[PDB]
Amino acid sequence: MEIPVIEPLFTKVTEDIPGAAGCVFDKNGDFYIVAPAVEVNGKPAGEILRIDLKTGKKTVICKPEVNGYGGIPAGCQCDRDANQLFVADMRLGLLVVQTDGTFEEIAKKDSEGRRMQGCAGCAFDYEGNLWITAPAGEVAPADFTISLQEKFGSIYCFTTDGQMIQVDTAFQAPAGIAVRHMNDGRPYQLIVAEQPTKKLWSYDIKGPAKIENKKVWGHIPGTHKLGAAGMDFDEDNNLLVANFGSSHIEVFGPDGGQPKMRIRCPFEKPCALHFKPQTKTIFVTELENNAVWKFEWQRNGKKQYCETLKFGIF
Template identity: 55%
Template sequence: MEAVEPKFTKVIDGELGAEGPVFDKDDNFYMVAPEVMKNDNYSGQVLSIDLKTNKSSILCKPTVDGVGGIPAGCQCDKDNLLWIADMRLGLITVDKNGTLKQVCKEDNSGRTMQGCNDCTFDYDGNLWITAPAGKIAPHPYERSMEDPFGSVYCYTNEKEMVMVDTGLRFPNGIAVLHSPDGRPNTLIVAETPTKSLWAYEIQGPGKVGQRKLWGKLPGELEGGPDGMDFDEDNNLLVAHWGSGVLEVFGREGGSPHTRIKCPFSRTSNLHFRKGTNEVYVTEHDSHGLWMFEWKRAGKLQYCDVISM
């Protein structure tokens, strides 16, 4: 395995959490601060980050029916709407004015939604979501670190919420591998406690094949896979939570071929800036955001892809 140690530049730190980095269509940058306790209630934040001044401002504090959220993952659609995976509130949207909407409380089978952690759009506009928490508020907050009740959803481009798999221990980061013609091909899901990256053949909106092991993080380091993002050559960069590194897998998975050393240990997520090799990484040591330059540019996101 190749080991590299690029120069990291600190963008910001001292936030009340650091997850879900994302750029919108206009190159504005956002991230989330997941777990902020206030008066025995969660009070997570969606943050807007000015990358010119390295200053943050609160765009939104997700709340539904008096219950505060735990926003953990974030993506942008073609209308510049932010879609946020929330561990207490499920799937929510936030517009540029900070207006929040809870997308749904049940899936298409009438089951109460589970709390969500991360999400990613495929190029057809389907949103794939990991859900490692128990039933959304007002149900008690539970996490599937030990008991494997974690699930994977797809919110289709026809506005239908479909549970595509369950029985996972804390499903976390999520990514879609596309074929050369832009067709969604493979869904990849991180299962943090087992150090596993699982693959599903995408058969259509909300339809996948059987779960198969796609990759495995090395066992000599602590932690497991968290957030992830593809570069333009379909190498998958994976945040190795608790280890202080990013692991890089080729498009066929297996074992990582490169390890990127970070100046912090609790890596949580990463995201490429459009059209560049700049990678923005969130971490929980100082609850900060950092940037480094990778060997290649990132894969285009759904919000930036011209309609096929």
Template identity: 55%
Template sequence: MAGADDTKFEFSKIADGIAGAEGPVFDTKGNFYMVAPSVEKNGKHAGQVLKVDLNTGKTTLVCEPSVGEDGGVPAGCQCDKEGNIYVADMRLGILKVTPSGQYQQLFKVDSEGRTMQGCNDCSFDYNGNLWVTGPAGDIAPSEYRRSFEAPFGSVYCLTKPGKVIRIDTGLWFPNGLAVRHDESGEACQLIVAETPTKLLWSYDIKGPGLVSNKREWAKLPGNLEGGADGMDFDDKGNLLVAHWGTGHIEVFSPEGGSPAKRIPTPFKTPSNLHFQPKSRTVYMTEHDNNGLWKFEWETCGMPQFCEKE
């Protein structure tokens, strides 16, 4: 752990009872959304996209995505400049959800004609390209599989012109991801969490759907327990990573390596985190009680694509 000591922060609970609690995101009007991927009805997947009142903790159903008779398992969310929510779904791939709750499955195959894999998390770069992890097997109606059992997970880029390019495959459950930009605002680095190995992989971004120089960027502490889940950059270039199963957020400096700080959480299974725009407030989901929490970090979050003019 390179001497990283626990750094205490005060956490406040916002809501609980949200089945699977994932995908926290703000839209362009300050509305807060998240997903409940673990909802089932009649023994079938029926995951939900929810709007949350952060003052009361009350949730409102936005949509319950499905394709044919196959319900979704929504996991990660991002917002575009028009206020639409893009959802990485473990059964349905990539979805686009409008503010009114209408949704569509964007792609069934990638740019080379391969069936899309189920997706888990996503992150826009400042040019509007959406980078997406795909840790599941082929989308519904194929059998539901996850790459914890074998390393068939992939990483995609949904380019602004509108095609999905698979940029890597052969990963053990690729999970959270984040994009770093250079001083000119161009996307320059992609970080991808590989949960079972506790590794964070780095790729140099050369253009929409084009990467090179894959390398190990960091590794989370510990041996068997837990693994990296969702993540977000602050405006100093530090990466905050939810360390599922260990009750910690790991904070990495821009150079990666070992954590510079470890933040203990009041729950064992932090799953995802997201900065409120233009603030130090971090909203965090957790699986112990299917909850949503918040805390104040040391600096503001990195601006999101939907905030950029």
């Protein structure tokens, strides 16, 4: 059982973005990168940037900061009803960021009164609930910590009613995250990457912030220390998963298990992925060259929540 590999042509899009992680298309087809970077001394110096795709030129729209504590934004999703970005920050929690660069911190505490943990990945379901991974410890002003060895990583659901609910915990560095939907649009499965354990986990989604039947859903190949990072579904509900401790993007079928195909990259350390809406084009961030690339996949992406806005014919 050798896993078949393809080597499509990758094209460089932009470069020199230290930590280039989360990326997203907004409702105008503009492209954003979050850059969870620090300065030499270690002070957070996170950034959210917009990329001109015909030129690769970059524009910093936001340097998140709260009480002089800098952000480490890592993951991002675009909203549906308003063109605004929900941003998962490893120092600041969940931010909502306008295209005009202004932002709001969403929650200092969760629904049980606990201080919020720093967040990394997030995925809207089609009902507008945001599922979030939190591999960091408490948000600032607490000292930064990371569940790369100890199991204090957590999962949240930020519901359409405005509740920040912790739905599971005791993960070792949860990273990427995605929601599988049935053909009729109902959220069905939550998939969570547990980065250093090489596991992808699945839950049955029974409602807003109600998940159960947790199980190991997929295995990430590779012998290195870090496995899965970012992930996204294609329109057939194949899950593409950046394998950080490698030069590959893994492709799982709807049934999980072992990858049914691997995509070899011209670089190590793939981090985040995102389809361009209505195209087969996948954008990939990677931390060997701190750069962004694109390549063509075999079919279009699964529509993100922000693509599901509909309007009465009147």
